[PDB]
Coordinates of C-alpha atoms and ligand atoms in Angstrom, one line a residue:
Chain A
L1 CA 36.9 -6.3 17.7
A2 CA 34.6 -7.0 14.6
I3 CA 32.2 -7.3 17.0
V4 CA 33.0 -4.0 18.7
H5 CA 33.5 -2.8 15.0
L6 CA 29.7 -3.4 14.5
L7 CA 28.3 -2.4 18.1
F8 CA 30.1 1.3 17.0
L9 CA 28.3 1.1 14.2
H10 CA 24.8 0.7 15.1
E11 CA 25.0 3.3 16.9
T12 CA 25.5 5.4 13.8
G13 CA 24.1 2.9 11.3
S14 CA 25.7 2.5 7.5
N15 CA 26.5 5.5 5.2
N16 CA 25.4 6.2 2.0
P17 CA 26.7 6.5 -1.4
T18 CA 25.3 10.0 -1.2
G19 CA 26.7 11.2 2.0
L20 CA 23.1 12.3 3.0
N21 CA 21.0 11.9 5.7
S22 CA 19.2 8.9 4.9
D23 CA 16.7 8.5 7.8
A24 CA 13.6 9.5 5.3
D25 CA 14.6 6.6 3.0
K26 CA 15.6 2.9 5.4
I27 CA 14.4 -0.1 4.5
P28 CA 15.0 -3.5 6.2
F29 CA 17.5 -5.9 6.2
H30 CA 16.5 -9.3 6.2
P31 CA 15.3 -9.3 2.3
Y32 CA 16.7 -6.4 0.8
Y33 CA 20.7 -6.8 1.8
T34 CA 20.4 -10.2 2.8
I35 CA 19.7 -12.0 -0.4
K36 CA 22.5 -9.3 -1.7
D37 CA 24.9 -10.4 0.6
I38 CA 23.9 -13.9 0.2
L39 CA 24.8 -12.9 -3.8
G40 CA 28.1 -11.5 -2.9
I41 CA 29.2 -14.4 -1.0
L42 CA 28.4 -16.7 -3.6
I43 CA 30.2 -14.3 -6.3
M44 CA 33.9 -14.3 -3.5
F45 CA 33.1 -17.9 -3.2
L46 CA 33.5 -18.0 -7.4
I47 CA 36.5 -15.5 -7.3
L48 CA 38.0 -18.3 -4.6
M49 CA 37.3 -21.6 -6.0
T50 CA 38.5 -20.1 -9.6
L51 CA 41.6 -19.1 -7.6
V52 CA 42.1 -22.1 -5.8
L53 CA 40.7 -25.1 -8.4
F54 CA 42.5 -23.5 -11.7
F55 CA 45.8 -21.1 -10.8
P56 CA 46.6 -22.2 -6.9
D57 CA 50.2 -20.1 -7.2
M58 CA 49.3 -17.4 -9.2
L59 CA 49.5 -15.1 -6.3
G60 CA 52.0 -17.2 -3.8
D61 CA 56.5 -17.7 -4.5
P62 CA 57.8 -20.7 -6.0
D63 CA 60.6 -20.6 -4.1
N64 CA 58.3 -21.1 -0.2
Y65 CA 58.2 -24.7 -2.2
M66 CA 61.6 -25.1 -1.2
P67 CA 63.2 -26.0 2.7
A68 CA 64.0 -23.7 4.8
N69 CA 67.9 -23.0 4.3
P70 CA 69.9 -20.4 6.2
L71 CA 72.9 -21.1 4.4
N72 CA 71.2 -20.3 1.4
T73 CA 70.1 -16.7 0.7
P74 CA 67.5 -16.2 -2.4
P75 CA 68.6 -13.6 -4.6
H76 CA 65.6 -11.9 -4.2
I77 CA 63.0 -11.0 -1.0
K78 CA 59.9 -10.0 -1.1
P79 CA 56.7 -10.3 1.5
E80 CA 53.3 -11.8 0.2
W81 CA 51.4 -8.6 -2.5
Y82 CA 49.4 -7.0 -0.2
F83 CA 52.6 -6.2 2.3
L84 CA 54.4 -4.6 -1.1
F85 CA 53.0 -0.8 -0.7
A86 CA 54.6 -0.9 2.3
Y87 CA 57.5 -2.7 0.9
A88 CA 58.2 0.0 -1.0
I89 CA 57.8 2.6 1.4
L90 CA 60.5 0.6 3.5
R91 CA 63.2 0.5 0.6
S92 CA 62.4 4.2 -0.6
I93 CA 63.2 5.7 2.9
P94 CA 67.3 5.8 2.6
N95 CA 67.1 5.1 7.0
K96 CA 66.2 2.3 8.3
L97 CA 64.6 3.8 11.3
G98 CA 62.3 6.5 8.9
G99 CA 61.8 3.2 6.6
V100 CA 60.2 1.4 9.9
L101 CA 58.4 4.7 10.9
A102 CA 56.6 5.4 7.6
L103 CA 55.6 1.8 7.3
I104 CA 54.2 2.1 10.7
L105 CA 52.4 5.5 9.2
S106 CA 51.5 4.3 6.0
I107 CA 49.3 2.4 7.7
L108 CA 48.2 4.9 10.8
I109 CA 47.7 7.9 8.1
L110 CA 44.4 5.6 7.6
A111 CA 43.3 6.6 11.4
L112 CA 44.6 10.2 11.2
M113 CA 42.3 10.5 8.4
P114 CA 39.1 11.6 10.4
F115 CA 40.7 14.4 11.6
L116 CA 41.9 15.7 8.2
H117 CA 37.7 15.5 6.9
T118 CA 37.6 20.1 6.0
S119 CA 35.0 19.7 3.9
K120 CA 31.1 20.7 4.1
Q121 CA 29.9 17.5 2.1
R122 CA 30.6 14.0 4.3
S123 CA 31.1 11.6 0.5
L124 CA 32.9 12.5 -2.8
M125 CA 29.5 11.8 -4.7
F126 CA 29.2 15.3 -5.2
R127 CA 33.3 16.2 -5.4
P128 CA 35.5 15.9 -8.5
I129 CA 38.6 17.1 -7.4
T130 CA 39.0 15.2 -4.7
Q131 CA 37.7 12.7 -6.6
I132 CA 40.7 12.6 -8.9
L133 CA 42.9 13.0 -6.3
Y134 CA 41.4 9.9 -4.9
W135 CA 41.6 8.1 -8.0
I136 CA 45.1 9.2 -8.3
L137 CA 46.3 7.9 -4.6
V138 CA 44.8 4.7 -5.6
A139 CA 46.9 5.0 -8.9
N140 CA 50.7 5.6 -7.2
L141 CA 49.6 2.5 -4.4
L142 CA 48.9 0.3 -7.1
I143 CA 52.5 2.0 -8.1
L144 CA 54.0 1.1 -5.0
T145 CA 52.8 -2.1 -5.3
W146 CA 54.3 -3.0 -8.2
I147 CA 57.7 -1.4 -7.4
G148 CA 58.2 -3.1 -4.1
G149 CA 58.0 -6.2 -6.5
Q150 CA 60.5 -4.8 -8.8
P151 CA 64.5 -5.1 -7.8
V152 CA 66.8 -2.5 -6.0
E153 CA 68.0 -0.7 -9.5
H154 CA 67.1 2.3 -11.2
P155 CA 64.9 3.5 -11.7
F156 CA 62.7 1.3 -9.8
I157 CA 64.2 3.5 -7.2
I158 CA 63.1 7.3 -7.7
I159 CA 59.5 5.9 -8.6
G160 CA 59.3 4.5 -5.7
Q161 CA 60.8 7.6 -3.7
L162 CA 58.4 9.7 -5.5
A163 CA 55.5 7.8 -5.4
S164 CA 55.9 7.8 -1.4
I165 CA 56.4 11.6 -1.6
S166 CA 53.3 12.0 -3.5
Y167 CA 51.2 9.5 -1.6
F168 CA 52.0 11.5 1.7
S169 CA 51.6 14.4 0.0
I170 CA 48.0 13.0 -1.3
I171 CA 46.4 12.2 1.9
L172 CA 48.2 15.0 4.1
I173 CA 48.4 17.9 2.2
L174 CA 46.2 17.5 -1.0
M175 CA 42.9 16.5 0.0
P176 CA 42.3 19.5 2.8
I177 CA 43.2 22.1 0.4
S178 CA 40.9 20.4 -2.4
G179 CA 38.1 20.0 0.1
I180 CA 38.8 23.7 1.2
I181 CA 38.8 24.9 -2.5
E182 CA 35.3 22.9 -3.6
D183 CA 33.6 24.7 -0.6
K184 CA 34.7 27.3 -2.2
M185 CA 32.7 26.8 -5.5
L186 CA 29.8 26.2 -4.3
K187 CA 30.3 29.5 -2.3
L188 CA 30.0 27.8 1.0
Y189 CA 33.5 29.0 2.2
Chain B
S1 CA -42.4 -18.2 7.9
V2 CA -40.4 -15.2 7.0
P3 CA -42.3 -12.5 5.2
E4 CA -41.6 -13.1 1.5
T5 CA -40.9 -10.3 -0.2
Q6 CA -43.5 -9.8 -3.2
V7 CA -42.1 -8.5 -6.4
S8 CA -43.6 -7.2 -9.1
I9 CA -40.7 -5.9 -12.2
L10 CA -42.6 -3.5 -15.1
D11 CA -42.2 -4.1 -18.8
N12 CA -40.1 -1.2 -18.6
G13 CA -37.9 -3.3 -16.5
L14 CA -38.8 -1.5 -12.8
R15 CA -38.5 -4.5 -10.5
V16 CA -41.1 -3.6 -7.8
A17 CA -40.6 -5.4 -4.3
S18 CA -42.4 -4.8 -1.2
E19 CA -42.2 -6.5 2.2
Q20 CA -45.2 -6.1 4.7
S21 CA -45.0 -5.6 8.4
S22 CA -46.8 -4.2 11.3
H23 CA -45.4 -1.0 11.6
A24 CA -47.7 1.5 10.5
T25 CA -44.5 3.4 9.1
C26 CA -42.8 2.2 5.8
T27 CA -39.7 2.8 4.2
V28 CA -40.1 3.3 0.2
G29 CA -36.8 3.0 -2.0
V30 CA -35.4 2.9 -5.7
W31 CA -32.1 1.6 -6.0
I32 CA -30.3 2.2 -9.6
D33 CA -27.3 -0.4 -10.6
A34 CA -24.9 2.7 -11.4
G35 CA -22.0 3.9 -9.2
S36 CA -18.2 5.3 -9.7
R37 CA -17.7 1.9 -11.6
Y38 CA -20.2 2.8 -14.5
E39 CA -18.1 6.2 -14.9
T40 CA -15.2 6.9 -17.3
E41 CA -12.5 9.2 -16.1
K42 CA -14.6 12.0 -17.6
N43 CA -17.8 11.7 -15.5
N44 CA -16.4 10.7 -12.5
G45 CA -18.1 12.9 -9.9
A46 CA -21.6 12.9 -11.6
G47 CA -23.3 10.5 -9.6
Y48 CA -22.1 12.3 -6.4
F49 CA -23.2 15.9 -7.7
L50 CA -27.0 14.2 -8.9
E51 CA -26.9 12.4 -5.8
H52 CA -26.4 16.2 -4.4
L53 CA -29.3 17.8 -7.1
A54 CA -31.9 15.6 -6.8
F55 CA -33.5 16.8 -3.8
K56 CA -33.4 20.9 -5.4
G57 CA -36.5 20.7 -7.3
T58 CA -37.9 18.8 -10.4
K59 CA -40.0 20.0 -13.2
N60 CA -43.4 19.6 -11.5
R61 CA -42.2 20.3 -8.2
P62 CA -39.6 23.4 -8.8
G63 CA -37.2 24.1 -5.7
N64 CA -37.8 24.0 -2.1
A65 CA -41.6 23.8 -2.3
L66 CA -40.6 19.7 -3.0
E67 CA -38.6 18.5 0.1
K68 CA -41.8 21.4 1.7
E69 CA -44.5 18.1 0.7
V70 CA -41.4 15.2 2.4
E71 CA -42.0 18.0 5.5
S72 CA -45.5 18.1 5.4
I73 CA -46.2 14.2 5.9
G74 CA -42.9 14.2 8.0
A75 CA -41.7 12.2 6.0
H76 CA -37.4 11.4 6.1
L77 CA -35.8 12.1 2.7
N78 CA -32.1 10.1 2.6
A79 CA -29.9 9.1 -0.7
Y80 CA -26.8 7.5 -1.3
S81 CA -24.1 6.6 -3.4
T82 CA -21.7 3.8 -3.2
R83 CA -18.9 2.5 -6.4
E84 CA -22.0 0.0 -7.9
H85 CA -25.0 1.3 -6.2
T86 CA -27.5 4.3 -6.0
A87 CA -30.1 4.7 -3.4
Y88 CA -33.1 7.4 -3.4
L89 CA -35.7 6.3 -0.2
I90 CA -38.2 7.5 1.8
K91 CA -39.3 6.3 5.9
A92 CA -42.9 7.7 5.9
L93 CA -46.1 6.6 7.3
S94 CA -48.2 3.8 5.8
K95 CA -51.4 6.0 5.0
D96 CA -48.6 8.2 3.1
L97 CA -47.6 5.7 0.8
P98 CA -49.0 6.9 -2.9
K99 CA -47.6 10.7 -2.7
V100 CA -43.7 9.4 -1.5
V101 CA -44.2 7.1 -4.4
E102 CA -44.9 10.2 -6.9
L103 CA -42.4 12.0 -4.7
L104 CA -40.0 9.1 -5.6
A105 CA -40.7 9.2 -9.6
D106 CA -39.9 12.9 -9.7
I107 CA -36.8 11.8 -8.3
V108 CA -35.6 9.3 -10.7
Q109 CA -37.4 11.0 -13.6
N110 CA -38.2 14.8 -14.4
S111 CA -35.9 15.7 -12.5
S112 CA -34.5 19.7 -13.1
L113 CA -31.3 20.2 -12.4
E114 CA -30.7 23.9 -12.2
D115 CA -27.8 25.4 -13.2
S116 CA -27.5 27.9 -10.4
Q117 CA -27.6 25.3 -7.9
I118 CA -25.1 23.6 -10.1
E119 CA -22.6 26.5 -9.2
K120 CA -24.2 26.1 -5.2
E121 CA -24.0 22.7 -5.1
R122 CA -20.2 22.5 -6.7
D123 CA -19.0 25.0 -3.8
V124 CA -20.6 22.6 -1.7
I125 CA -19.0 19.3 -3.0
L126 CA -16.2 21.3 -3.3
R127 CA -15.6 22.3 0.2
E128 CA -16.9 19.1 1.2
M129 CA -14.5 16.9 -0.9
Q130 CA -11.5 20.0 0.9
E131 CA -12.7 18.6 4.2
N132 CA -13.6 15.5 3.7
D133 CA -9.8 14.4 3.8
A134 CA -9.9 14.9 7.5
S135 CA -11.9 11.9 7.5
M136 CA -9.0 9.3 8.3
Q137 CA -10.7 5.7 7.6
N138 CA -12.2 7.1 4.0
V139 CA -8.7 8.1 3.2
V140 CA -7.2 5.0 3.7
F141 CA -9.8 3.5 2.3
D142 CA -10.1 4.8 -1.2
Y143 CA -5.9 4.1 -1.1
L144 CA -7.0 0.3 -0.5
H145 CA -9.7 0.6 -3.4
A146 CA -7.4 2.9 -5.6
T147 CA -3.9 0.5 -5.1
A148 CA -5.9 -2.2 -5.4
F149 CA -8.1 -1.8 -8.5
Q150 CA -5.5 0.2 -10.3
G151 CA -6.3 1.3 -14.1
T152 CA -10.2 0.0 -13.6
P153 CA -13.1 1.8 -12.9
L154 CA -12.9 0.2 -9.6
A155 CA -10.0 2.6 -8.3
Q156 CA -11.8 5.5 -8.8
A157 CA -13.5 7.3 -5.8
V158 CA -17.7 7.8 -5.7
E159 CA -16.7 11.9 -5.1
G160 CA -14.5 11.9 -7.9
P161 CA -11.3 14.1 -8.4
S162 CA -11.8 17.8 -7.5
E163 CA -11.0 18.3 -11.2
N164 CA -14.0 16.6 -12.5
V165 CA -16.1 18.3 -9.6
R166 CA -15.5 21.5 -10.9
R167 CA -15.8 20.6 -14.7
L168 CA -19.1 19.0 -14.7
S169 CA -22.0 20.2 -16.3
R170 CA -25.6 20.0 -17.1
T171 CA -25.7 18.2 -20.1
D172 CA -23.0 15.6 -19.1
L173 CA -25.4 15.1 -16.0
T174 CA -27.7 14.8 -18.1
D175 CA -26.2 12.1 -20.1
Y176 CA -25.2 10.0 -16.5
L177 CA -29.1 10.5 -15.4
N178 CA -30.2 9.3 -19.3
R179 CA -27.8 6.6 -19.6
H180 CA -27.3 5.1 -16.3
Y181 CA -30.7 5.1 -14.8
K182 CA -32.6 3.2 -17.2
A183 CA -35.8 1.1 -16.2
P184 CA -34.4 -2.4 -16.1
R185 CA -31.6 -1.5 -14.0
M186 CA -34.2 0.1 -11.2
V187 CA -35.7 -1.4 -8.0
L188 CA -38.6 0.2 -6.2
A189 CA -38.3 -1.6 -2.9
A190 CA -41.0 -1.4 0.0
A191 CA -40.7 -2.6 3.7
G192 CA -43.1 -2.2 6.2
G193 CA -46.7 -1.8 6.5
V194 CA -47.6 -1.9 2.9
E195 CA -49.2 -3.2 0.5
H196 CA -47.6 -5.2 -2.5
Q197 CA -50.9 -4.7 -5.2
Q198 CA -51.2 -1.2 -4.2
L199 CA -47.4 -1.0 -4.3
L200 CA -47.8 -2.5 -8.0
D201 CA -50.6 -0.3 -8.6
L202 CA -48.9 3.2 -7.7
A203 CA -45.4 1.6 -9.8
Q204 CA -47.7 1.2 -12.9
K205 CA -49.0 4.8 -12.7
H206 CA -46.3 6.6 -12.0
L207 CA -42.5 5.5 -12.6
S208 CA -44.2 3.3 -15.6
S209 CA -42.2 6.3 -17.9
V210 CA -39.1 5.2 -17.2
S211 CA -37.0 4.7 -20.1
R212 CA -36.1 1.5 -21.5
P213 CA -12.1 -6.9 -16.6
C214 CA -12.3 -6.4 -12.9
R215 CA -8.5 -6.8 -11.8
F216 CA -7.1 -6.9 -8.2
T217 CA -3.2 -5.7 -8.0
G218 CA -1.0 -6.0 -5.3
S219 CA 0.5 -3.0 -4.1
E220 CA 2.1 -0.2 -1.1
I221 CA 0.7 2.4 -1.4
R222 CA 1.6 4.6 1.6
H223 CA 0.8 8.0 2.2
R224 CA 3.0 9.7 5.1
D225 CA 2.7 12.4 7.2
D226 CA 3.6 12.6 10.2
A227 CA 1.9 15.1 12.2
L228 CA -1.5 13.1 12.9
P229 CA -1.3 11.4 16.6
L230 CA -3.2 8.1 14.8
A231 CA -2.5 5.8 12.0
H232 CA -5.2 3.6 9.8
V233 CA -3.7 0.8 8.3
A234 CA -6.1 -1.5 5.4
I235 CA -4.8 -4.8 4.2
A236 CA -6.9 -6.6 1.9
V237 CA -7.1 -9.4 -0.1
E238 CA -9.4 -10.3 -3.6
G239 CA -12.7 -11.0 -2.8
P240 CA -15.1 -13.8 -4.6
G241 CA -18.0 -11.5 -5.5
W242 CA -21.9 -11.4 -4.6
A243 CA -23.1 -14.1 -6.3
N244 CA -20.4 -16.8 -5.0
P245 CA -21.8 -18.5 -1.3
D246 CA -19.0 -18.8 0.3
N247 CA -18.7 -15.4 1.2
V248 CA -21.3 -17.1 3.9
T249 CA -17.9 -18.9 5.0
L250 CA -15.6 -15.9 4.4
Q251 CA -18.0 -14.2 6.8
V252 CA -18.2 -16.5 9.3
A253 CA -14.3 -16.3 9.3
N254 CA -14.0 -12.7 9.4
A255 CA -16.2 -13.1 12.3
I256 CA -14.1 -15.5 14.1
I257 CA -11.4 -13.1 13.5
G258 CA -12.8 -10.8 15.1
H259 CA -11.2 -8.1 17.2
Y260 CA -8.3 -9.1 19.6
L261 CA -3.5 -5.6 20.8
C262 CA -3.4 -2.3 19.5
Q263 CA -7.1 -0.9 19.5
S264 CA -9.2 -0.4 16.0
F265 CA -9.5 -3.5 14.8
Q266 CA -12.0 -4.2 12.7
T267 CA -13.0 -6.8 9.3
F268 CA -14.1 -5.8 6.2
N269 CA -16.3 -8.0 3.1
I270 CA -16.7 -5.5 0.3
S271 CA -18.5 -7.4 -2.6
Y272 CA -19.0 -5.8 -5.8
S273 CA -20.0 -7.5 -9.0
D274 CA -17.7 -10.8 -9.0
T275 CA -14.9 -9.1 -7.2
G276 CA -14.2 -7.7 -3.5
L277 CA -12.1 -6.2 -0.6
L278 CA -11.6 -8.6 2.1
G279 CA -9.6 -7.8 4.8
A280 CA -9.0 -5.5 8.0
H281 CA -8.4 -1.9 8.9
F282 CA -6.4 -1.4 11.9
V283 CA -5.6 1.9 13.9
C284 CA -2.8 2.7 16.0
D285 CA 0.3 4.0 17.6
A286 CA 3.9 4.1 16.1
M287 CA 5.2 0.9 17.5
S288 CA 1.9 -1.5 17.7
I289 CA 1.7 -0.7 14.2
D290 CA 4.6 -3.8 13.3
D291 CA 2.8 -6.3 15.8
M292 CA -0.7 -5.9 15.2
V293 CA -0.1 -6.5 11.6
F294 CA 2.1 -9.6 12.7
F295 CA -0.7 -10.3 15.4
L296 CA -2.8 -9.7 12.5
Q297 CA -1.5 -11.7 9.7
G298 CA -1.2 -14.3 12.4
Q299 CA -4.7 -15.0 12.9
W300 CA -5.6 -15.0 9.4
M301 CA -3.2 -18.1 9.1
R302 CA -4.3 -19.7 11.8
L303 CA -7.8 -19.1 10.2
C304 CA -6.0 -21.2 7.2
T305 CA -4.6 -23.9 9.0
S306 CA -6.0 -24.1 12.7
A307 CA -9.5 -23.5 12.6
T308 CA -11.6 -25.5 15.4
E309 CA -15.2 -26.0 15.6
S310 CA -15.9 -24.2 18.6
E311 CA -14.5 -20.8 17.1
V312 CA -16.7 -21.8 14.0
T313 CA -19.6 -22.0 16.1
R314 CA -19.1 -19.0 18.0
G315 CA -18.6 -17.2 14.3
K316 CA -21.9 -18.7 13.2
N317 CA -23.7 -17.5 15.9
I318 CA -22.3 -13.9 15.6
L319 CA -22.9 -14.2 11.9
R320 CA -26.9 -15.2 12.6
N321 CA -27.3 -12.7 14.9
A322 CA -26.0 -10.4 12.9
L323 CA -29.0 -11.3 10.3
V324 CA -30.5 -8.7 12.6
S325 CA -29.4 -6.5 10.2
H326 CA -32.5 -7.5 8.3
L327 CA -34.3 -7.1 11.0
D328 CA -37.6 -6.0 10.8
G329 CA -37.8 -2.4 10.4
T330 CA -38.6 -0.9 7.8
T331 CA -35.5 1.1 6.7
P332 CA -32.9 -1.6 7.0
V333 CA -35.0 -4.3 5.0
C334 CA -36.0 -2.0 2.5
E335 CA -31.8 -1.8 1.9
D336 CA -31.6 -5.1 2.1
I337 CA -34.2 -5.7 0.3
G338 CA -33.0 -3.2 -2.3
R339 CA -29.7 -4.9 -3.0
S340 CA -31.4 -8.5 -3.2
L341 CA -32.4 -7.3 -6.2
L342 CA -30.1 -5.2 -8.0
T343 CA -26.9 -8.3 -7.2
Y344 CA -28.5 -11.3 -6.7
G345 CA -31.6 -10.7 -9.0
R346 CA -33.8 -12.2 -5.8
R347 CA -34.6 -11.6 -2.7
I348 CA -32.9 -14.5 -0.7
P349 CA -34.7 -15.4 2.6
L350 CA -33.3 -15.6 6.2
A351 CA -34.2 -19.3 5.8
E352 CA -31.5 -19.7 3.1
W353 CA -29.1 -17.4 4.6
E354 CA -29.8 -20.1 8.1
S355 CA -29.2 -23.1 5.8
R356 CA -25.9 -21.8 3.9
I357 CA -24.8 -20.8 7.6
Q358 CA -25.2 -24.5 9.4
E359 CA -23.9 -26.2 6.3
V360 CA -20.3 -24.2 7.2
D361 CA -18.1 -27.0 9.1
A362 CA -14.5 -26.1 9.9
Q363 CA -12.7 -28.3 7.5
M364 CA -14.5 -25.7 4.3
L365 CA -14.1 -22.9 6.3
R366 CA -10.2 -23.2 6.2
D367 CA -10.4 -24.6 2.8
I368 CA -12.0 -21.6 1.7
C369 CA -9.5 -19.5 3.9
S370 CA -6.8 -21.1 2.4
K371 CA -8.1 -20.6 -1.2
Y372 CA -8.8 -16.8 -0.2
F373 CA -5.9 -15.5 2.5
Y374 CA -2.8 -18.0 2.0
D375 CA 0.4 -16.9 -0.2
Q376 CA -2.1 -14.0 -1.8
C377 CA -0.4 -10.5 -2.8
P378 CA -2.8 -8.0 -0.5
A379 CA -3.6 -4.4 -1.3
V380 CA -1.7 -2.2 1.9
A381 CA -3.1 1.2 2.8
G382 CA -1.8 3.6 4.9
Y383 CA -2.2 7.0 6.2
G384 CA -0.3 8.6 9.3
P385 CA 2.6 8.5 10.8
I386 CA 3.3 4.3 8.9
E387 CA 6.9 4.7 8.8
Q388 CA 7.4 1.5 11.6
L389 CA 4.2 0.1 9.5
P390 CA 6.5 -3.0 7.2
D391 CA 7.1 -2.4 3.9
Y392 CA 5.3 -5.5 0.9
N393 CA 8.4 -8.0 1.4
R394 CA 7.5 -8.7 4.9
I395 CA 3.6 -8.4 5.0
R396 CA 4.2 -10.9 1.8
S397 CA 6.0 -13.2 3.8
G398 CA 3.6 -12.8 6.4
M399 CA 1.0 -13.8 4.3
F400 CA 2.4 -17.4 5.0
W401 CA 3.9 -19.9 7.2
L402 CA 7.0 -21.3 7.0
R403 CA 5.6 -24.4 8.8
Ligands
HEM1 C1 38.5 -7.1 9.9 C2 38.3 -6.4 8.4 C3 36.6 -5.9 8.4 C4 35.7 -6.1 8.3 C5 35.4 -7.6 8.2 C6 34.9 -5.4 8.4 C7 32.8 -5.6 8.0 C8 32.4 -4.5 7.9 C9 31.2 -4.5 7.7 C10 30.3 -6.0 7.4 C11 30.7 -3.4 8.1 C12 28.7 -3.2 7.5 C13 28.7 -3.4 6.4 C14 29.8 -3.0 4.9 O1 30.8 -3.4 4.9 O2 29.2 -1.8 4.2 C15 31.4 -2.3 8.1 C16 31.2 -1.0 8.1 C17 32.1 0.0 8.0 N1 33.6 -0.4 8.1 FE1 34.4 -2.3 8.5 N2 35.3 -3.8 8.1 C18 37.0 -4.2 8.4 C19 37.6 -3.5 8.5 C20 37.5 -2.0 8.5 C21 38.5 -0.9 8.8 C22 39.8 -1.1 8.6 C23 38.0 0.1 8.9 C24 38.5 1.5 8.9 C25 39.7 2.2 7.7 C26 36.3 0.3 8.4 C27 35.4 1.4 8.8 C28 34.4 0.9 8.5 C29 33.1 2.0 7.9 C30 33.7 3.3 8.3 C31 31.8 1.3 8.4 C32 30.9 2.0 8.2 C33 30.8 2.2 6.5 C34 29.2 2.8 5.8 O3 28.3 2.3 6.3 O4 29.7 3.7 5.2 N3 36.2 -1.4 8.6 N4 32.6 -3.0 7.8

């Protein structure tokens, strides 16, 4: 699927942070973005080996070092941290089914994302209001990651419920309206 | 038994050389060690504009009456300017040898620059430059000189920028004339049916009045204009200079390279005073651009690594057959003579050239080619649809082999 991912991209070429047509300024990849990928590989290996050789259990759970007891239940059940945002959403919706669906949508909302683009500019380099909304989205994604960790009790629950409401409202509603407003400010709309 | 070029410098410093031949027609010229390299960016077109003004009349021969004289004997009058040398030459009969010399004397001294003419020649020069851009290979070689000799007086063109052309005055010209036309920097060269003693007496009679850190830079300059049908690309490295004998070996290598892919391949070894540009200027379609390069770079590395005796023998024969450059014709020889005395300080005979050619073998050719081509930073000048022309890392990586 990653090979198919690379194919569906070379047909169009990569994007640039300005979001403009970069056909006038393109360079080879071997000497310019290869040594850059090698440097990024080296930095990622530095972070991976300082995660392995120095703090090998800062991201895992201690209770996984006990054998599986079907009779004994743990006092607090978590998935690993990268599932937390989803975990929060699931817990937030009162209805079980609702939670499952919202959870799925949490990931799927992204797929839905290319149909929500209502701006005449591709990138957010020249779009400050949608930049603010994007960083608020990153902020409450971090909040949902924290909440998942917190146990079920006040006021963690309410935050979870709001954070999920704010997440879906920023992705679904606030960004296209903001893009319309930004197009109106540049005398385009 | 090559006819020797007898030379007779004057006390003023005017070297007077001549070589006699059967031809009853003789070519006489004056060479001056003055070009765009001696200009200081405030008079960047002084030599070119003086080269335009030099045939428009003198003090003794005012206006077109002067050129009426060179029509009267049926002689031909030519002049040219490079970055280092300026030449004023006449092709005439032998029996018209005195007056021609006298004519040349006026052209170098006693010349008259008319203010009226200055405006007319400014419009000529300006317009020509305004249309000179048409000649691509000239644009590409000027771009190569600029990007290879940035910050030096060797980057600036012979014609100069339109700016200076418009902003030039008699006095400035007078200066360039009075500064770079010294007698010790002048050679009176004659080739063909001339006697050396008669030419020396004529130089004593007239012309006896004449008054008595170069750096290469590797850089990618790219003039992209996609509306042009063809692309011209020149790639060069630093040359040794005039006085370095391995030039001869490099000439053989240039010969061996010859021209094999996209059309319009070529090779040059341009030499200036202890510097130069050694390289190739191909011209081609959008796609061939890269390969040709790739092609071209491979040939250079082959000459650095895998030179055989047969191609060296072929290049030596091509170079010798190129001594025809000397030939016997009055003009070419005279020209050759002109440079010899300005650059080497002497006329190198063809027997010495043949000795320096026959001492060249394959081992010293690949040694000298590795000295001048292998792992060197080139100067690249492109003009036209040059998007597929590779940038500097790919060319620099093609300047060596991993094997
Ligand atoms: C399996 C995990 C993934 C891998 C290893 C991966 C790898 C890559 C690589 C190597 C590129 C080209 C270089 C670059 O990253 O800028 C790329 C481009 C891209 N990927 Fe992914 N990708 C992954 C998942 C995703 C997902 C899930 C999406 C959609 C949400 C996505 C969307 C894109 C887009 C849009 C580009 C073009 C980016 C641009 O040029 O602006 N990829 N991917």
